[PDB]
Structure formats: C-alpha cells, structure tokens
Design a binder for this molecule. Structure first.
Ligand SMILES: NCc1ccc(C(F)(F)F)cc1
Length: 330
C-alpha cells in the first residue's frame, strides 16, 4: 500500500508545515507537524490543561471506539528550541493520506509549554526519526513509519516541501514526476537516532565550491539551516550590512539587501538554495532589519538541514535495512 498527503505552510514565512492526519474511529482529523528530527506522535487532547489550549483541535479518546489506554505508559519530551510536552499514552488507528496503521501509540499531552499553546494552527507532531528516540517508558513505542513499513510497497517516504506553497509527503513510493534529473543517494548513520548524513561541501552565490565534510541531520521539524560558524560567517560576509545580533540571537541583514544563493553538496551533486528562501522577513513589524535563514549551529551542538534546505530539493527518506537519503533538484 501507499499514502499521499498535502502539507501546507502555517504562515507567510514557512515557519512550519501542517499535514492532516486521521486518528480514531470515527476519524478525528488533526493537523500535525511532520518531524523527521523526533520519534513521538503526540497530540493536543481532552486531557490537556484547559489554560494551555488556545484554538487547537483536540483528540478525544473517549469518542473513539478503537482507542485503548496503554496502561502505565508515560512520555516526556524536550525539544532543541526549549519547548516541551508530556502526558499519558493511548493506542488507536492512525491514517495519513489513505495509509492506515492500527495500534499506533498516540501520546496524549496532559501538559504543553507556551511555544505550542501560542501555535493555534499546530495540533501536534508526527515523529519520523528512528524509533530508538521515542520517549515512552517503560516500553518504547514505534513511529508511524516503523509501524507502516511491513505494508508499504517500498520502505520509503518522500518530502517535497513548497516555498510559500503547499507540498507533499508520500509514503511507499517515489513519484518520478516530482523531480528533475537523477536522485543522488548518500549514507545515513542511525547512531544518534536521526537521519544523519554528510554533505560534501558548499558555495556562496556564484563563488567556488569548497569541498569539506559537514555532518548534519535532515530535519523537517526545524525551520532554519544551522551550519558551522566558519560556513555561516563566509555566507553573511557577502551581504552588505549583515551582522550577528545578540539582541536578536542570530544574523540579521538590511531588509533592502539582495541575498546570494547557497549551495550544499550531496556526494557529487549540488543542491542550490535560492537567496529568496533565506529571507525570514523583518525581525519586528515595520523594522528595516531582516532575519536570516542560515544561522550558526555552535550553540546547538549539531548541524541541522532544516526546511530552508529541504524545500529546495525532492527528498527521499529510504528506511531499508541499510538506510539512505536521496536528493534531487526540482
Ligand atoms: N522540532 C520540533 C518542534 C516543532 C514545532 C515547534 C513549534 F513550531 F510548534 F514551536 C517546536 C518544536
């Protein structure tokens, strides 16, 4: 079997992407943020603290005939940005774009941080990293991708994110019409539980390609591109007036400047990110200072190929016994 679902940006800046997911019997549709950087499927629910809910659609397990409490199981997760959530666990039927999994662990959020509460368009997350990162205790639970693997025609999923436009998440098949040229595959290390890979280098605008190894993770759940300080400083040195701001907590640039493209290497292939994708708009309403989409990973400890990078390519997440990442221009 296969699954195909449309993903839509939550705002004019592509800060996040939401994809509709059907949970329970009868179906309860929630808009979840598909995250290849985490492994928990957690939702806002009838059990979430009333004051911590602001306009989100909630999962009500009492209204689902297929919902069962996973007795004793709890979860607690903390994200790199600082956000966090926790609660109890249910098992229920979950469907994404026609692809159905029975007995999927659905983590019901009893408590959520302010970061999620203020985000009315996002009803939860659907984790797509390796199941070894799942936070359910005492019994670790599988991801939606892990549980669907046996029924999929091919153990793959693809991300085709749009720039200020809808995109697609496909499960079980590779759409040969969604990309141009060939797909370049690269090895994945699952040691830390992430889709971790090594880029072969980079270029700024029409400058020369610097062959250098950059280990990083393919993360659909992170908005920006976080790279080593050396690389980020070489990019921002080409933008007149750009500077790292302590007030803002990152590189800012004059809203009137034009941004060069950024190229990253995938084996022998090149993925070009257009300058426009690196513009995150004014730091505040009416400000003339704009926020950059390429930031330093020095304070985080890991390089992250987030939405900025991924939306410039057709990305294949190959979950075969020896996992790989596929990249193609589109
Ligand atoms: N990487 C996980 C993640 C996803 C979304 C959010 C947001 F946007 F809701 F704040 C925070 C953290």
């Amino acid at each position: 079997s296969t699954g195909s679902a449309t993903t839509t940006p939550i705002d004019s800046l592509d800060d996040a992407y939401i994809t509709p997911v059907q949970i329970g019997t009868p179906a309860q549709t929630l808009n979840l943020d598909f995250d290849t950087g985490s492994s928990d499927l957690w939702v806002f629910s009838s059990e979430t603290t009333a004051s911590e809910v602001d306009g989100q659609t909630i999962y009500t397990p009492s209204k689902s005939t297929t919902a069962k409490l996973l007795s004793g199981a709890t979860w607690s997760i903390s994200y790199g940005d600082g956000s966090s959530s926790s609660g109890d666990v249910y098992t229920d039927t979950v469907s994404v774009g026609g692809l159905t999994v029975t007995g999927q662990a659905v983590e019901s959020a009893k408590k959520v941080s302010s970061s999620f509460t203020e985000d009315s368009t996002i009803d939860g997350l659907l984790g797509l990293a390796f199941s070894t990162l799942n936070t359910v205790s005492p019994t670790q639970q599988k991801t939606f991708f892990d549980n669907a693997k046996a029924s999929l025609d091919s153990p793959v999923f693809t991300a085709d994110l749009g720039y200020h436009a809808p995109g697609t998440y496909n499960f079980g098949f590779i759409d040969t019409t969604a990309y141009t040229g060939s797909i370049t595959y690269t090895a994945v290390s699952t040691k830390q539980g992430f889709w971790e890979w090594t880029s072969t280098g980079y270029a700024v605008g029409s400058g020369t390609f610097k062959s250098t190894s950059i280990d990083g993770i393919a993360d659909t759940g992170t908005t920006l591109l976080y790279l080593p300080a050396t690389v980020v400083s070489a990019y921002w040195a080409q933008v007149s007036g750009a500077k790292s701001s302590s007030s803002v907590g990152g590189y800012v640039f004059p809203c009137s400047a034009t941004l060069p493209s950024f190229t990253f290497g995938v084996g022998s292939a090149r993925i070009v990110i257009p300058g426009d994708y690196i513009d995150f708009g004014p730091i505040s309403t009416g400000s003339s200072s704009c926020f950059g989409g390429i930031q330093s990973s020095a304070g985080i400890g890991i390089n992250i190929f987030g939405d900025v990078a991924l939306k410039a390519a057709f990305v294949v997440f190959n979950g075969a016994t020896t996992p790989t990442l596929g990249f193609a221009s589109k």
